[PDB]
Amino acid sequence: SHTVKIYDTCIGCTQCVRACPTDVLEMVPWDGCKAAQVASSPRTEDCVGCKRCETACPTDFLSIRVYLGAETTRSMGLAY
């Protein structure tokens, strides 16, 4: 399915997890001193690719990037 990649420029807004409709994302802690918050993509099978996460990311350019790929019943949002 699709792949959501999260890069070093995260700052811990948490907005990506909120805008997501499918709960593909989760905020995890960082062992480092940067912050106690990093975005993750644990369940990418439910990613549909609506790019709402990329609309809520206030970086110079996207810390969290969604790369489209192979399709499935879930990623296409087909209730039939």
Partner 1 sequence: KARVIVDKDPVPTSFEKWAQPGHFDRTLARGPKTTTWIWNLHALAHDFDTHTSDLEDISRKIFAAHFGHLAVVTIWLSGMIFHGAKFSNYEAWLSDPLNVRPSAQVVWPIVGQDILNGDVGGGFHGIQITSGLFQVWRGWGITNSFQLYCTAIGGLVLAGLFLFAGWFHYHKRAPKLEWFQNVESMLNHHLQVLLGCGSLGWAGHLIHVSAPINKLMDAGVAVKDIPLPHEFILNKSLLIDLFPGFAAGLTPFFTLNWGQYADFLTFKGGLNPVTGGLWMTDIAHHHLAIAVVFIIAGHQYRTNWGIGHSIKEILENHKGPFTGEGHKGLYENLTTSWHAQLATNLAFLGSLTIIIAHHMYAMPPYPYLATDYATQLCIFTHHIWIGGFLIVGGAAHAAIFMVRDYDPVVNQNNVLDRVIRHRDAIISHLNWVCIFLGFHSFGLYIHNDTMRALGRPQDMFSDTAIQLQPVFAQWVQNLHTLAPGGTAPNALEPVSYAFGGGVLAVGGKVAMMPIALGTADFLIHHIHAFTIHVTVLILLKGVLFARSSRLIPDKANLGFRFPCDGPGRGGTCQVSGWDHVFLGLFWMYNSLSIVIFHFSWKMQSDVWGTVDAAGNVSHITGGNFAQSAITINGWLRDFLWAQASQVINSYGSALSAYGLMFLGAHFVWAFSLMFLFSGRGYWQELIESIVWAHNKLKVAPAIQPRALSITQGRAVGVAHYLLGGIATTWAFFHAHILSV
Partner 2 sequence: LSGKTPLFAGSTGGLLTKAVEEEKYAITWTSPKAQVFELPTGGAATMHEGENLLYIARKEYGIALGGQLRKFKITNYKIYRILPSGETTFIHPADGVFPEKVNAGREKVRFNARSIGENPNPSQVKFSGKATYD
Partner 3 sequence: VQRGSKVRILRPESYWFQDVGTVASVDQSGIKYPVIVRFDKVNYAGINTNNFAVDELIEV
Q: Considering only residues 28, 35, 36, 76, which one is a binding residue for partner 1 as defined by CB under 8 A? A: 76
Distance CA 51, CA 38 (A): 18
**Interaction residues for ligand SF4, span 6-65 (CB under 6 A):** 6, 10-16, 19-20, 22, 24-25, 39, 47-53, 56-57, 59, 63-64
Contact between 44 and 1 under an 8 Å Cβ cutoff? The reply is yes
Rounded to the nearest 10°, the torsion over CA 61, 57, 73, 80 is -130
Q: Which positions make up the binding site?
A: 10, 13, 16, 20, 47, 50, 53, 57
Q: Which positions make up the binding site for [4Fe-4S] cluster?
A: 10, 13, 16, 20, 47, 50, 53, 57
